Design a binder for these strands. Structure first.
Length: 50
DNA sequence: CAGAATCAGCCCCAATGTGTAATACCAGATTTATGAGCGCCATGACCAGCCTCAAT
């Protein structure tokens, strides 16, 4: 959310929630793919497994 | 003389401690595997006498 706030633009006329949701979900998924296993697995291989 | 205050004595409530036998894509950077190559310790082939025997 802080990262999304750092790059939000209000001139487009869209609400902040639509822009912030993408960043929040991307950060959450990246964290899950990074630090949720005892043995680290790369993001591309995690995506292939999914 | 009765009053209630601030201290020990007493009591109710909480707490811990015990309990046995064999998503998606995008771009930029990195690395392991096959490319050959220099270079060599050690395989197989000689090759000179000092070391080890014989007859007179």
């Amino acid at each position: 959310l802080m990262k999304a706030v750092d790059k939000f633009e209000y001139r487009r006329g869209y609400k902040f929630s639509t822009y912030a949701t993408w960043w929040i979900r991307q950060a959450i998924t990246r964290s899950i793919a990074d630090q949720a296993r005892t043995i680290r697995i790369p993001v591309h291989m995690i995506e292939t497994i999914n």
